[PDB]
Every structure is written in C-alpha cells, then in structure tokens.
Amino acid sequence: CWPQLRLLLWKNLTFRRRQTCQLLLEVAWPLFIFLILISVRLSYPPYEQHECHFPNKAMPSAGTLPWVQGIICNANNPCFRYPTPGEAPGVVGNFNKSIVARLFSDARRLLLYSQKDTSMKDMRKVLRTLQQIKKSSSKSEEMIQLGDQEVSELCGLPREKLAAAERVLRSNMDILKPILRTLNSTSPFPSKELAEATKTLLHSLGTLAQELFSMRSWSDMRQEVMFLTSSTQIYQAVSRIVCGHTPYCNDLMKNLESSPLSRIIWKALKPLLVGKILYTPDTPATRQVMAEVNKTFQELAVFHDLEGMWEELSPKIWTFMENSQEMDLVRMLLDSRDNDHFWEQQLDGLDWTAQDIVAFLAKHPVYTWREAFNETNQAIRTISRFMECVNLNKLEPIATEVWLINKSMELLDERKFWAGIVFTGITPGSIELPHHVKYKIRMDIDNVERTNKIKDGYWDPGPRADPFEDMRYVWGGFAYLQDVVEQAIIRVLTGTEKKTGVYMQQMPYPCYVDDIFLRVMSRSMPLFMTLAWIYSVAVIIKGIVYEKEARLKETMRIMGLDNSILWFSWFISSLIPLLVSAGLLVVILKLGNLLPYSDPSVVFVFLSVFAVVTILQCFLISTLFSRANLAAACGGIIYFTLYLPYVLCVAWRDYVGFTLKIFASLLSPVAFGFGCEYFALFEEQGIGVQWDNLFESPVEEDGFNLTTSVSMMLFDTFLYGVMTWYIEAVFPGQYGIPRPWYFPCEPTHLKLGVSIQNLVKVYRDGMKVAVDGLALNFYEGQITSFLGHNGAGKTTTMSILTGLFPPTSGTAYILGKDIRSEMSTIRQNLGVCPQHNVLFDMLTVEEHIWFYARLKGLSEKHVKAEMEQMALDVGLPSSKLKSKTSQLSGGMQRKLSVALAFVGGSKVVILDQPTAGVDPYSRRGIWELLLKYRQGRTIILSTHHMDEADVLGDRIAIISHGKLCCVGSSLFLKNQLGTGYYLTLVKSAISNLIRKHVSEARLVEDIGHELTYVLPAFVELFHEIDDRISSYGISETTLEEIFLKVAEESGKGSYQVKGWKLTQQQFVALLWKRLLIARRSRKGFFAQIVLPAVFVCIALVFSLIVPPFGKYPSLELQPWMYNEQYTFVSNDAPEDTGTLELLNALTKDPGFGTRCMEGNPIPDTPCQAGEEEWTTAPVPQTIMDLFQNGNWTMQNPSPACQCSKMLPVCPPGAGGLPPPQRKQNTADILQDLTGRNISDYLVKTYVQIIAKSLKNKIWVNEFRYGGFSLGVSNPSQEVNDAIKQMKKHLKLAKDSSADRFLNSLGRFMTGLDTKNNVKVWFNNKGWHAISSFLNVINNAILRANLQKGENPSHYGITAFNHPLNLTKQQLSEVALMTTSVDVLVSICVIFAMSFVPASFVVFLIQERVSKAKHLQFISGVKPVIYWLSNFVWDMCNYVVPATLVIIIFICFQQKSYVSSTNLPVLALLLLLYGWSITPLMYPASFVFKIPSTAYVVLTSVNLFIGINGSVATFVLELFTDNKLNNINDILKSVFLIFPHFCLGRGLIDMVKNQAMADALERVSPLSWDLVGRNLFAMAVEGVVFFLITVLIQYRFFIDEDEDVRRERQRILDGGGQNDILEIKELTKIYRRKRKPAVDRICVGIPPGECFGLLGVNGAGKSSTFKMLTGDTTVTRGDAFLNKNSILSNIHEVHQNMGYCPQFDAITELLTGREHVEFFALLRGVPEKEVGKVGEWAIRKLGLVKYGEKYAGNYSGGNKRKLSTAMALIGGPPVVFLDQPTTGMDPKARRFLWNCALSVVKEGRSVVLTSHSMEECEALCTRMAIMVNGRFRCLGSVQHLKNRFGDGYTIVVRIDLKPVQDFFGLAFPGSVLKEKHRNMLQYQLPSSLSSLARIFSILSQSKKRLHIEDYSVSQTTLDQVFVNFAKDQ
Ligand SMILES: Nc1ncnc2c1ncn2[C@@H]1O[C@H](COP(=O)(O)OP(=O)(O)OP(=O)(O)O)[C@@H](O)[C@H]1O
Ligand SMILES: Nc1ncnc2c1ncn2[C@@H]1O[C@H](COP(=O)(O)OP(=O)(O)OP(=O)(O)O)[C@@H](O)[C@H]1O
Ligand SMILES: *[C@@H]1O[C@H](CO)[C@@H](O[C@@H]2O[C@H](CO)[C@@H](O)[C@H](O)[C@H]2NC(C)=O)[C@H](O)[C@H]1NC(C)=O
Ligand SMILES: *[C@@H]1O[C@H](CO)[C@@H](O)[C@H](O)[C@H]1NC(C)=O
C-alpha cells in the first residue's frame, strides 16, 4: 500500500508545484486576518494602570453635608494613585479643605459665640448710662456749610482757624468751649463707672471683630463666586468651592443637561431633587418610619425657609446698619486717639485694621457694608430660586402593591421616580414591629444593578471602577435610600437619637493591567476562526468533487488503486498545507502578542487536531454530492450552519449540561469553538496552557474542559470517517456499484475472458431504453470489434463492464469474476481508455505514463523501459513528453489515452473509440501497438472506422439499440450477409454500358462522386471501363456496406430581421434559454439560490432561542451568596466610648448578620454553630526580616513591591503580619485588623492570595468582598442651647419664617457631628456586596443600640433588591446583547449574499471553456446584448433570494431591519448590492478554466473582504476612544471600493440607528452619512463594472511545392474578384514555443467548390480555424471573408460564417431542437419560421429519436450531428467544418456528405477538415495537406492522385510469406508497405496498364493460395496521406 500512497503523494506534490500561487493563497488565507489582527493590536498595547485608591463616599447617616460632598467630589473615581487620608483609621473627614465645611463650622462658631455673647447688653447699658448721666448725646450760611462739611474729630479746629483767618477773634473764645469736648474723645474721662463700662464694651467689640475676621470663609466664598461669574477653569473653581484640590428651574435643569461638569454628577442628582419615593399601606409603624425618613430628608431643607428669614429680618438688619445709635457710638469708639491703639493691641497685628473696619462699616451715603449686603441678598435669592421647584415632599402613601407598581409606572412616565420601599407588615395595626423587618427596594433597572447575576462570570482584572456602568449603587440612589431606611428602622426599634456615621470605601486594586484587546479576542476568536477554514473546506470539497466527477478518481481506481489509499493520500495532501498554516498561525499568535501566556506547542497540537477534524468533515461533505458546481456552494454553507449550535449554546449559557454540550459538539464545529473560548478565558486570566492546565478549565461547571474537547474531536473524527466510508459505499453518486444497505451486517479453445449476460441499463432521465440484451463473449487472444451506431450501447456497455455505470439487469463475468460483487478484483487487472480524454492537466505526458506504470507495480527501470516502448510504438515525436497535456491537440491526447491503457500488466483492455480525430498515419502505429499486445490482453475494439475493425478485429460484433445483431469474424459476416463485387469509380450512359456488358448490374448509392455499383464477362467489362473517370477500383463486400445493411434492417428563412428587432429577438432568445436552463436544473438552483436563504433562516432560528427577559427575581442583600469570602474587622481607637459596644455586638451570638437567629430566614443557607477561638495563622520563618527591620511607621508598614503578568510577584512577607482568624458561625472567617494599615495590608494579601491560588491553576475567583473599620471622629446640646438663646432673644416670635428657619438650622447643625463611625470597605467586583455589607453593619448597629433586651438574636433587618419588571431589562445589557446578535446576523447575511452572485459566473465558464459563447458570437449576437441578458437574468436570480430573505426578516419581526423606516431602505440596499456585485463577478471567467474553482475563489474573496471590513470598521468605531478611528473613516472611503463592505456598513448603520433610537426612547437611514452613500456608491460601481466588463469583452480596443507557390503568387499579385475566402500569409505563433503552428498560408476559395484541409495531428488546422472565426489572435497576414477583413471588422465576417468546432460546444440542459431554434433566433430567423427551419435542420441530419432529448446526454455521433446542424443554420456562404465526422457511424457521415453536397450545390463553400481519407476523396473538390503549418499539394483530388501517385494499389487479407512470394513472382516491382499480421498492401506503378489483367491473374490464383479477401483501388488517398506523413 506504500508505493501507491507515495505515488499519489508525489502527484499531489507535482500538482502543488505547478500551481504555487494557489498553495500560497491557501496557506496565507488565515495569515491575512491574523496580520490585520496583530497590526491593530500593535496600536493598542496593554495599558499599565497604576495602583490607585478610591475616596470614601459619605452616607446620609453621617450628615447631609458630607453626603452631598461625597456625591459631588468622588463622582468619577479619580484614582488619586495614593492612599487618601479618608482610608486612614484615625481621620475620616477628608473634606476639611473645602470652603463649604469651613463656612458651616464658622457659622456654628458664630452661633456659639452669640450664645456666649453679651456685647449687645454691654452697649445697651453704655447707651443707658450715657443717657442717664449726660442726657445730651444726639457769613452765616458760609460758616454753617463749612461747619457741616468739616464736622469731624479734628476738622472743627481747622474750620475755626480758617474762619478766624478772615474774621475777628469773636469766634475764637467759643472755640475754647469745643476744645474741651474734642468731638466726644475725652468725654469718658469725666465719669468713673462709664470708663469701666466703655472698656468692657471695647473688649467685647474687639473679641467680636476678631472672631468675625478670623472666620475667613465668607471672603473665599465671595472671591470664588465672583471669579466663577468660558473654559475648563470653571471646573477647578467649582471643585475648590465644593471640595478641596416653574419654567426657571426647568431652564436650569436644561442648562445642567448640557453638562458643563461631570455627567455622573447630574446623573446622581437627578433622582435626588427630582425623583420621588413611595411605600406600602399606611401602617402606623410604617408611618413613623416614613416620618423619620422625611425628617432625615428635610434636614437638608434649611434653604427652603431661608427666604422667609430673609424676607422678615432684612428690614431690621437694614435699619440696624443705617440709623441705629448703637452703631453710631460704635463708630465713635472706633476712631479716637487711643482707641486705635487699643484696637491694634487687641488685633494682635492681624489684617483688616480699624481703618478697614471703619471703611467697611461706616458709610452714610469703594467697598462697604452696602455692596456686601447686596451680594448676600443676591446669593439668598439665587439659593431660594434653586430650591424652589425641588420636590422635598417625596412621600406618597399607596394602598397595595399593584397600585404601587402602577404609580411607579406613572411617575417614571413623568421622569420623576426614586426607589420604593415595600415592607412586609402582617396587619396595619399599632404594633411596634415584628422584630424582623423584611423590606424590598424596588426601583428602575437603569439606576440599580442587575440582579439576574451576582458576579461578572469569568474572572478578569479590574476593580470595576466605572462610575456609570458598574457603580449604579452610588449614583442611582439605592445605597443612600437603603441607609436612610435602615437608620429609620433602627431609630424606631430602639429610640436612640444619636446615629453612628457610615462611610463606604471602595477596595483599591494592585496596579492591574487592562487589555480591551483581550476582551475583543475572547468575544471574536470563534468568529474570526471560521472564515479562514471555510475557505479551506470550500477548496478541499471543490477539488475532491471535481476529481471524482471528471472520472479521474474512477479511472485511477480502474488502473489499480483502491479507495483507502486515495483517501489517505487526500488526507495527507490536505493536512500538510493545513499543518504549515497552523504552524504559521501559532507563530503569529505567539509573536503578535495575541496569545502570549499560552504555550505554542499546545496551540499547535490543538490546531492540528482541529485540522484533522476539518479534513474528515470535508470528506464527509464531499461524499454527499457528485457535481462540483453544487458542492462549491454547499460545502461552506453546511460548515457554517453546523457552527450555529455553538452560538446557540453561547447565547444560552444556562440549563445546558455536560451531556447536552457533548451532543451539541457531536457535529464538532462547537468543540473547536469551546476550545477557542477556553483558550481566550485562560489568556484573559493571564495563565495560558503550559501543558498542565489541561483537564481543568471550569468557569462555572463540573467537567467540561479542554481535554474533553480534544477527546470529543477524536471521537468525532472516528465517527466522520466511519460515516464517510459508509456513505461512499452506499451513496457514491453516479459512478458506483453501489453497496447494499445491509452491509456489513465460436472458439471453444480460448480462455473466454469477458462474457456478458442480458445486460440492461436504464438512465433516470426518461428510462432511456437503450440496452435491451447482450450475450457477447470476449476471448483472450482475439480483438472483438464492438461496433454499433450512434446510441447503440457501446460506451454504456464498456462503462458497465468497468466500475462506471451499474447494470439494471443481467451480469458480466470478466475472467470468471463477476462485476456486481468482485469489482475491485477485476479492476486490479483492468485497463481502460474511454471515449473522452480523462487525464490530468498539470501533469505532462512522461509524468502521466510514469504514474500509470508505477500504479501497477513495475520497477523504476521497468517503468522507464515501458515509457520508452510506448513512446516509440504509439508515435510520439519525443518532443511532447515534457509538455503539459492541456496544450496537446485531440490526436495527441487520444494517442496518450490509448497508450495509458496498455502500460503495465492488464489482461483485460477496454478501448472506447481509440481513434477519434487521429490521422491515418498514427492510426497505423495504433494498429501495430494493438497487434503487438494481442497475446492475452483481451483487446476490445470499439471504433467507427470499418478498415480498422476489419483488419484488427478477428471476431467483430455489430449491435443496434442494445440488442445483438451479428457476431463473428469477417468471413462469417461476409459470406452470410450480402456479398458481391462493389465497383466504385469517380465521375445515364454509364449505367447502360455496364448493363449491356454484364447481366446483373444495380446502382445502390451516388453520394460525392462515388457511384457505387454492385455485381453479384467481368474481364471485358473492366476493359470497357478502362479503355473509355481514370479511376477504376473494385472490392469485395467490405465492412462499410455490411454495417450499412445491418443498420438499415434495424432553410434560412425569408425575412432576416436586423436592427432593434433582431436585438430584441436575440434578447428574448437568451432569456428563454436561461429560463430553460434554470427550469431543468432544480438541484443547482436550490443549492446556489435557495440554500443561502435557508442558511439565513436557520441562523435567525438559532438566534431566536435566546433566553427570555423581563424576569428579575428578588435578590436578598446578604453577603452569603459567595461561598468562600474573607471578612476583616478593624477596631480603631478602642476607648470604650461608642466603638467597643458595636464591636462586641458585631461578633456575638446574633452573628455577622441575620443569617441564623432563632431560625434561618434566608433560603438554602445553613450556618455553622460551633466555632469560637482566636488563633493566629502559622507564619513561616520570615519574622526576622520584619523584627530586625523594625520601627515600621504607619506609612509603608510592609516592604512595598514594584509593578513592572497581571499582578506583581515578590517574596512572602507582603502583608507583614498574619492576623488571628476566627470563624463567626457564618461560614466565613474574620481577621482582626486592630492597629494595622488597611489599604496596604489588603492590597498585599490580595496579591499573595491571587498568586498562590493561581500557581496551582484553580481558576482564581474573588478572595474578599467586604470588611468593617470602626472608629471615632475628632456638640449637640451646645448648639441646641445656642439656637434656643438666639430664638428667645432679639424679638422672639412664633411665625413660620424665623422660628422654623432657626429650628431647621439647629437640626442641620446637630446632624453633622458623629460620636462614632464605621467605614465599610467593599470590593466593587461583587455586584451586590456593598448593599449587603451595608445591611450587615446596620444590623450590627441595631443589635448594639438595643438596651437591656432578653437576647439580641431575634432582632434584625433584611433588605431585598427587586428591580422593576415594567418594560425593559437594562441599558448596557441589551446594548451589548442586541448589538452582538445583530452583528452575527449581519455577518450571516453577508455570507449568504456573497455565496449567491459568485455562481453567476459558473454558467459563464460553462460557456467560455467550450465554444458555445464563441458560437453565439459567430451569430449576429453582439457582446453587449449577451451581457445585458445575463445581467437581467442574474438580477432576477438575485432578487428571488433577496425577496426570500426579506420575507424571512419580516416573519422574524427583526425590528432592526424590517421597521417602518428600514424595510424599503434594506430592500434598496440589497438591490443595489446585487446590481453592483454582478458586473464585478462578471469579469472573472476570462482567467479561470474551471467553474467550481472560480466559484470557490470568488465566494471566498467576497466573504473575506466583506466580513473582515465590516468587523474591522465595527471594532474601530465602537471600542476605540483614540483618534485612530478617524483614519478608519478615510479607510472607509478606500473600503468603499468593495460593494460587500458597503452592504455590511449599511447593515451596521441600520443597527446602530435602531440602537440609538431605542436609547433615545429609554433619524432616517436614507441620509448621506448613512446607507444613502452606500446606495450611490453601489450604483456608480455597478455602472463602472458593467462598462469595464464590456471593455474586457472587447479587449479594451473596440522552396515549397510548385502548386503551393503558384497559388501563393496568384493570391499576392492579383486579388480574387469572386472568391469568398481569401487568406494571405496567415501566421500563428503561440507563446513560449518559438515554433509557429501555422505560417504562410495564402488560399482562395471560390463560391462553387468544396475545400478540404487535411493534415497530421498537430499540423495547424484548428489554429487556422480559430483565427478565421476569431477565437485566437492572428499574428501575420489577413483573411478576407466576403470582402471583409478580420482585424478590421469581425461582425461582418461572423454574419456570413458557419462554424463547427472540433470539440462539442453544446448546453448540457438543452435539447437538439431547442439548440437549433435558439441558434436560428440568434441569426435573425423570424419567429414565424423558427419551427420550420428547426425541423428542416433536424431532419436533414437524422436525430429523429434524439430531437427531444437533452444534448448533454447525447452520444458520440449525435453531438457531432447537432454541431453540424447548428453550423448549417442561416445558410452562410462559407461553412467551416472542423472534424465533423469524429466517432460517427457511416450513416451519419453519409448524411453529412449529403448536407455538404446540398450546401455546395446551393452556391456556397465548405472548408472541411477530417481524418478519414475516403470522405475528402469523395466529396471534397480542392484539397490541401498541411504539415507543421505548410501546405504540400494544394490541388484537386484527381490532380493529387495523378501528380503524387500512379498505377493501382492492392489490399489483400488472409500464412503470410507465400503471399509475398506470389506478389514478388507475378509482379516484378511491388513495394510492400504497411505490413500487418492480417492484411497486406502492394503498389502497381512499377508494372504495366490494363488493371483487368492483374484482376484476372489474381482471380486465377485465388484458389491455389490461402487469400481470404482482395480489393483493388486506383491510387486511393490513404496511401497518399501515409506517404505524405512518412516524408516529414
Ligand atoms: N447521462 C445520461 N443520461 C441519459 N441518457 C444517457 C446518458 N448517457 C448516455 N445516455 C444514452 O445512452 C445511449 C447509449 O449511447 P452510447 O453511449 O452507446 O453512444 P456511443 O456508442 O458512445 O455513440 P458513438 O458511437 O457515436 O460514440 C445513448 O442513446 C444516450 O442517449
Ligand atoms: N493553448 C495552447 N498552448 C500552447 N500550444 C498550443 C495551444 N493550442 C495549440 N497549441 C499547439 O498547436 C498544435 C496543434 O495545433 P492545432 O490545434 O491547429 O492542431 P489540431 O487540428 O488540434 O490537430 P488534430 O488534427 O490532431 O486535432 C500543438 O502541437 C500545440 O503545441
Ligand atoms: C416632609 O418634609 C417636607 C419637606 O421636606 C414637608 O413639606 C413642607 O410642608 C409643606 C408641605 O407639606 C410645604 O408648604 C413646605 O414648604 C414644605 N417644606 C418645609 C421646609 O416646610 C412635609 O410637610 C413633611 N411631611 C409631613 C407629613 O410633615
Ligand atoms: C481637618 O483635617 C485635617 C487633616 O488633614 C486636620 O489637620 C485639621 O486640623 C482638621 N480641621 C479641624 C479639625 O478643624
């Protein structure tokens, strides 16, 4: 078995060497997409994210002001890269740098000061004592005005001096009176107690001013609000303000919608000041809880009653600063001689001295108290208008739960609906509480995290720090409302007024690396791993079906090879390139940074196993079809439909078990997908497969792993091989036996080689009754001439004898072995040579013979000897051995096929038409070869040459219609049947003269100057014929007339339409032909048109079984959902103030939460009972590096580790100290973190635990989820007393403007300080961990707040998370899922609509390889009209499946495509895509010669380009934040050159528009930027491609013999004025040959003769015919046909030309009559006379029974009959017949001679080429023999027989030597030529005249010798042609 396998491998290697481009493309098909992937990966390296921490969010329980500050500041998770002080155990504030907190603290300080202030009383008593003791303290005009203007402290004396300078001293003495007062300067010096009173008042004023000027907050606030009121500086301004480093409010909300800030801030503030909450029936307990919640909310309502305060106290404070005597005396005390010194001493040298005070406070009419008052009034007005339409009344009582859902819907329709608290009360009664409050928080899913899943599925690095996607618990209002409700329940159950502060700190992440490309790989690996192998399966299936369809596989199996060796050879020849491609792919994945963590060896092994699976699936699929055109369309489609179950199981991901996964992967496109998924999951986790991750790949599952997938692929390969063998044995197709279903469950002295018994064959077309009964017996040492007419059952019988066609009845024993059972044993010793040349194209002749000789077991030297022997006996000139067989002619191919049937040891030879198109010269060599191998090879001759069958055939057999007619030797059928003397002489009176010399004379046939007479006396008759055209020859009942007698016993219109009428006629004829072709071919139509629609339907079905939505179960907010977790507790500042009690109540009998407390009110979670011990974990020998390196300060308490994998790696000791762990009876162990740095310890322990659990390959899950840190803050009664004293004083009242405002301010001030607080450290990886740990810490607070209870066990609160099931599922969830499924269905649509158009060229190839398209161009059909008809037909054949896909999309209700605005756009998009892709796939048949190969290539190229461009643009515009996508836009324009890219982009734009519309509900697709540009581009591309293919069809441009020399000179000097065909110096030089096949041909054919072009095989006749018709390009010379040149205008030459090519060019799906009618419609025959012309052309060449049968099922003679009939359509003046008699019975050639004679007599010409010399010697007028492209005779038949011959020729038949002795004795000179073992030939010329004399002497010596038959001819053409061929 090894030699045949190595021979087949050598053949495949030679085939791949001859076509290196195809092999390179097959290897690099995955390389293209993989290089694109690594290139787009190089632009996105793994981002090294630093180890950053997150700020702490403040809860409303810790204060509304810090709550708002935490909402605004850390709304984006800035990741400050360093541990913030909020994470420190001591300080928790982190907001002491903001000016708002400083302003509130200064307001509290001012309130306390006013509580302890007496300055008002001091100034009041000072005013009182000055009024009781002093009782007085409140030239004319020129002096009065001067005194009024100069009324100052010291200006009085200056004014007095200025007055006295111009007046008398009378105003001076009075000046002495005012000098003692000094403007109330020394007035306190007079009294005693008034001095002390003024001193105390001045001290109080100094302290008050010092406080007011050390506030220092309102100054910064004013500066910031004046600087803010554009660029990015406003962000920093508002950050410095709020942090550290009806239609009016609607308009404000609209301005905020423009987001001049972080959008997350607005997203979080939307449910705060717009949303509204609701609760259950009004239970008085629930009523009190809601009232406490309302109080907590209205704590922030200090700005509501602020306007009421500023609308009542503004006049009082305005008059207090304008005309109050107290402020006047303050101003007086502020300015004096020593008061300024006192103020400077009391100010301690601070800023804003007394001058600034008097400039700001004292102003009667640039900055004073007036501008400050206006500014604060404007600020109060702005604050009131901002807090005007805010709904602080968010509390609506509801009577039930269905009404709750209805009101929730109604409020969400108004876009104002916050969370809803649903209690579980049993009775609306005055009971306090059931001690176990179960409450649910129902809100919209857009603001609450999804509850269907509790984890992110597969583990991926990242702290989940997206403030909008995965942080919905902090901006949606869930955690805040949860904390508020918990605090309310705690206050109701206990009654304590103080509230423990609550903070939420997100756990930091240890400098992980985010790689979005890893996610892209995990999402698109099984998708991008499909097309690269779809191309491979298409190529492999196409090649296999083309090998087994062209009878190559069957011929090879007949030659001696079995099936298993061929299957192994195909497997190896498909695996080696696939192995190279897999190795290159592994190298690309390893070097391209795509799979850096996986071992390349494991990837290579996996890819090799997948390639084996792929090859066996290819074998299985190929064994299902028989035609390559159907397989080329079915293979990839089936391979892609079998992959859909993988996508189904991926979309399900639930309720699928191990056995279900096995059954889904039984087809095994799902095993490779699961393997790629596991590889991507291992890569995303930074592990890979280092030959040890096998057998364990569970994300969340039991057993399914990678080794399971490998074993399943092995089992699937075994099953595929078994099924392939079974199907190929049972259903092989049309070339099988086949095997049954229940498996394996008259020479009497010869060997009698082959014997048939009652052979019956029935074809399934019309039951095809052709072979009724055959009892033929073939012997060993005899050549049985299996003769028969066209369709008599010769080829069918010879195929039944082989393994080609199965017999319906009877049997056939070959060498004693049956064919129905022992077929392989017979084929092991069987040689065949069929009627059609079945041979490889890439292999040469010598390689062919070497292969077919080594296939039988001959040695290398023996094979070389056999090659040389065959090359010398067949007649090979030894120059075509190293040339490809595809370049050979018909004769050379036939000789090679005959030679390949005799090589090696084959005792049974079957030759069907061994001489078809072979010259009479090589026929002699074939005869010698058959005679040399006539010992025991059982040669079965089936030819149409009567001479060959009579010479070689020892026992001929003539049949008809399958029934046996006659069997026997030549003597038997010549003596039994009609015998006599047949006289044939070339040419009324002759009949009279032959009837007067002999008694019996009869005329039987007169066709082509033959005039054959039969004569059953003779010497005188021959003398009379001789002495009185010069061609006398008689014979004795040859085989021709015998066959004729056996067979006997068993027109161009009158209209000639032209112009538009002819154009329309040809168009309708082409459309009707295409319709007939599509009607009679339903399997191909279903596989190429309806199969993509079925594929789209199956894809939509698989995408329709997605899991249902709208189901959100109630998820409990408890941490007991993740099995293994690690909690930690931190006790900061243990001073027994408020922390130790909560710490004890947190780890006591009630436990961590409400899990097990007098029962388990949580489903399916039993808690452990007995565990209580504080045991420190065992620390290894690593305490020395920590003790000797002591003095570990709080900053960096453990040796930090660098971050260059995912997480850093460095030796143990990262945490530093193992804390004592203890199980708290809740299935989780807590660790005490007292006095430990929380952030660094947590980071280091996370790192070390991840490293330890990843080193063991355990699929690392989350380690910790939450922890608590209890601390204290660095009062209430004081500020309450301050508020009370402020209300009691200064005109106390009870209005709703001042008293309510003061009470609200006091409530706000007392709600900011916290005695103790708790920081909940939560990891955002858990989707519900923060809320659960909040509930846990609230339960702990409740347990610690109850006083003197019997037991704190039965106390507890539980929270449920039940999202709204109203209308939708989520935003991002659907935005990803629908996006993915739409991308999938768009890829499927691209696949389908790319599989369709590539078939349109297939038929075109079926017209271009053959001369069918050439014959259509010979008629009046122009290329433009033909291309237009093809375009219309393909447009219909494309809109049929387009309509099918549209109907499927309508029925599936895919709102993304068949919506009210996208359905017509989608239809137009599909129409334009087809209109643009059809003329793009049209210019592809001119380069390919195989229809299935071009089909596969075009389909693969289209799908690759389209899908790759679509997915590239998608991943570049969707998941890219860099500006590189901009370049992609330009690339779009470039990619606009591919229509598939335009279709994909249109689909993607429709999907994105629908997604944006749905997000808006949470634009027309005909715009320019949208699909409209794609439509315009498709239209332009269609027009341009149609023009391009039309231009392509127009080639972008629209010493010799005496007679030969005489004719050449006659043509040169003077042109013929009457000859139709005039050829001048015709020359043809093929490429890379340097030897012209035809050169220097100059002939003139008049319109009244018959021209014959004879020549040896390879002379240049077919090339000359192709140059005349226009198939090839003429190099030199010209050819005028009816005064029309070829290069000038070929249309006029074609309009008067009838071409009959050498090879049959007919449609396999059209009948003969339909062919004739079509070719008549093309040539201008009117429809009224089409039927008559068709009937005439049919009846003129027989075909009566075959007139209604398909031409593809015709016989060897019926095809030539149809070709000649089509050539005789239209009645052209010159009919070119190229081998029209090739394999036809004598009746067909007689009919053809009659047709040619009728054509010549009608006034036309016939350029005939044939290989039978009798034909051209009979009917042809002027003949020309060409050799190597040069003529030799160029004359008439009689002139040729006279100048190249003389005398007579004798053909005798018989034991051989006595005949030669007699011929040498009776004749002196007679050359013995063409000596055979059966016949002899002698020549007269060296003898005398009087042929009657030699006839008489041969008659007198016939009885003495053993001569069987004798014949005489007068210089026949056979010997002349043999001599001409032997010359050169
Ligand atoms: N694939 C087919 N489908 C239907 N009928 C067929 C098919 N192949 C052959 N036939 C029929 O079987 C009959 C047997 O014809 P056969 O093959 O003997 O012709 P032939 O002897 O090769 O002709 P020639 O002698 O001119 O070469 C024919 O009449 C033909 O119509
Ligand atoms: N496509 C081709 N490429 C290379 N050489 C070619 C090609 N076609 C024909 N030839 C050359 O032309 C020669 C045959 O010429 P042509 O086709 O005129 O003869 P033919 O009429 O087919 O012979 P026959 O009478 O045996 O059918 C061959 O020797 C071959 O080398
Ligand atoms: C719950 O609190 C809101 C304010 O947060 C209270 O609404 C106040 O009273 C009436 C409406 O009831 C309005 O005129 C006031 O302007 C509201 N604000 C203030 C600051 O008074 C509401 O009354 C409270 N609910 C109950 C039952 O008292
Ligand atoms: C605010 O916190 C800081 C800590 O950064 C502290 O130094 C400062 O004293 C605090 N201010 C107070 C307590 O008023």
Ligand SMILES: *[C@@H]1O[C@H](CO)[C@@H](O)[C@H](O)[C@H]1NC(C)=O
């Ligand atoms: C949502 O769930 C409630 C359960 O009380 C049900 O009454 C309602 O019909 C559901 N909504 C939809 C749209 O099914």
Ligand SMILES: [Mg+2]
């Ligand atoms: Mg045949």
Ligand SMILES: [Mg+2]
């Ligand atoms: Mg030829």
